[PDB]
């Protein structure tokens, strides 16, 4: 299946 | 700074 | 690995 | 105004 | 650094 | 009508 | 208005 | 694969 | 300034 | 048929 | 109609 | 390297 991943990298 | 980030996994 | 970023900078 | 922007990092 | 704007201008 | 726009920074 | 949608179709 | 799609709709 | 617009017409 | 088109605006 | 499809290929 | 790509798909 599709999974769409999120972040917030911090720099 | 704060970066957002999107990356799609075929899971 | 490929990150895409994304942003609204306000102007 | 608003600006969107998008840039890939090769991470 | 490059970063690439992008923009819908309803009209 | 819809325009879509693109416009490259040097940042 | 106008609404930007997103999709991820897997093929 | 995995195609990841943007159209926009005048509302 | 300068604003590239694209367009895709379906005929 | 798709044509795909492009026009710069002096803004 | 009409999709447009983005990709970004890491090599 | 990384490659972004686009194509159109008449649907």
Chains 1, 2, 3, 4, 5, 6, 7, 8, 9, 10, 11, 12 share one sequence.
Not at 1 to 11: L, M, T
């Amino acid at each position: 299946k599709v999974k769409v991943v999120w972040d917030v990298i911090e720099v």
